[PDB]
Amino acid sequence: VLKFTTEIHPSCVTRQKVIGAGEFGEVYKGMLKKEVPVAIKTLKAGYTEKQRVDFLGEAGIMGQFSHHNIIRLEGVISKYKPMMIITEYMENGALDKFLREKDGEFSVLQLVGMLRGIAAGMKYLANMNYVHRDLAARNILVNSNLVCKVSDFGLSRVLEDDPEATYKIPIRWTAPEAISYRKFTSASDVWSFGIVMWEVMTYGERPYWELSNHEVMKAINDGFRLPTPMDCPSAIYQLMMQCWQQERARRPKFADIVSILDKLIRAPDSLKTLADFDPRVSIRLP
Ligand SMILES: Cc1cccc(Cl)c1NC(=O)c1cnc(Nc2cccc(C(=O)N3CC[C@H](C(=O)O)C3)c2)s1
């Protein structure tokens, strides 16, 4: 896969600021030689064979894709150490943190547009035979045009690197069959997409609040589902609910999701009809 990747010389790359970090490398904002901003992920000397395969495997996978809603690879530094993966720079960072910092600042149409973009990237990945396994707002990046792009690619590194994945998966974003018998498919990614819809429409509320992982699994198995967000179009809540069908075959495909979201956006008055919100509090005044 790496034959598809541009090998970039280190003198073309300036790291400027740390924006992410782990035990074996960091992510930087930087510039790439007409200079352009880029994100730069490093792998420090001493890495194992498995770490090298996982790290360059992420770039190898990303280099196979060309889609507006999938993070673009610019190239790699593999002939010098530390090794680096260089991608486009998404100026607004991770979607979950972005929404929590911008609570209430977007229109419903803007939020639905973000979901359409995520769904288009996921339809592309699914049709390219790539199962994400860790779809969540924390793994979507947002640029200065409000474009949302799917990130976090690889094999075993995806669930290994995510702190939300517990002994190892991120339970409350994961479909039942993936938890119960390890069946990860594009239809389990659709379940996750339903969770991401709820994260977007709530401005980054944590799914299921303080329920424990066991309590979430028991609730889902008993037929409970997340309640409607505040100010959520009825069509959007119906769509996320259908993503959470227990029976995999009843879930929409991403092709259906993209189609529905595009129709709603193109007739935006459809989004003015809101699902009823069940208040958890009662305020009464004489
Ligand atoms: C997705 C991917 C896979 C492998 C290797 C790499 Cl280099 C990448 N690309 C990335 O991780 C990223 C691309 N764009 C990113 N943007 C980003 C991430 C986290 C925070 C921010 C952000 O909003 N910041 C605002 C304050 C600070 C700044 O102004 O740079 C950081 C931006 S991360």
Bridge partners for 52 per DSSP: none
Between strands 36-43 and 73-77, the pairing is: unpaired
90 lines ligand 1 (CB under 6 A): yes
Experimental technique used to determine this entry: X-ray
- Rounded distance between C-alpha atoms, residue 20 and residue 226, angstroms: 31
32 lines ligand 1 (CB under 6 A): no
73 lines ligand 1 (CB under 6 A): no
Q: Which long-range contacts (CB under 8 A, 24 or more apart) does 246-252 make?
A: 246/176, 246/220, 248/175, 248/177, 248/183, 248/185, 248/187, 248/188, 249/187, 251/187, 251/190, 251/191, 252/190
Q: Given the structure tokens 């193109």, which residue do they identify? A: 266
- Rounded distance between C-alpha atoms, residue 4 and residue 2, angstroms: 5
Q: Given the structure tokens 């939020």, which residue do they identify? A: 111
* Tokens read off for 171: 């339970």
Annotated active-site residue in 54, 96, 103, 134: 134
Q: Name which residue sits closest to atom 12 of ligand 1, judged by CA.
A: 39
Q: H-helix or E-strand containing 32?
A: strand 26-32
116 lines ligand 1 (CB under 6 A): no
Residue range(s) of every CATH 1.10.510.10 domain in the chain? 91-286
Bridge partners for 169 per DSSP: 166
Please, what is the end-to-end C-alpha distance for the chain in angstroms? 69
Which positions make up the binding site for ATP?
A: 19-27, 41
Bridge partners for 141 per DSSP: 94, 149
Name the residue among 278, 188, 204, 268 with its Cα closest to residue 236: 268
Asked if 133 contacts 189 with a C-beta cutoff of 8 angstroms, the reply is: yes
Residue range(s) of every CATH 3.30.200.20 domain in the chain? 1-90
Q: H-helix or E-strand containing 222?
A: none
Q: Residue 118: helix, strand or coil by DSSP?
A: helix
Instruction: Give, in words, the CATH class of 1-90.
Output: alpha beta
* Residue type (1 letter), 171: I
* Cα four-point dihedral sign 123, 127, 96, 228: positive
* Third-level CATH fold of 91-286: Transferase(Phosphotransferase); domain 1 (1.10.510)
Annotated active-site residue 134? The verdict is: yes
Best mutation site among 13, 72, 87, 88 for ligand 1 pocket (most ligand atoms within 8 Å of CB) = 87
Resolution of this structure in Å: 1.4
Supply the DSSP symbol for 226: P
Which residues touch 107 (CB under 8 Å, ≥6 apart)? none
What is the Cα 269 distance to its own chain's centre? Answer: 27
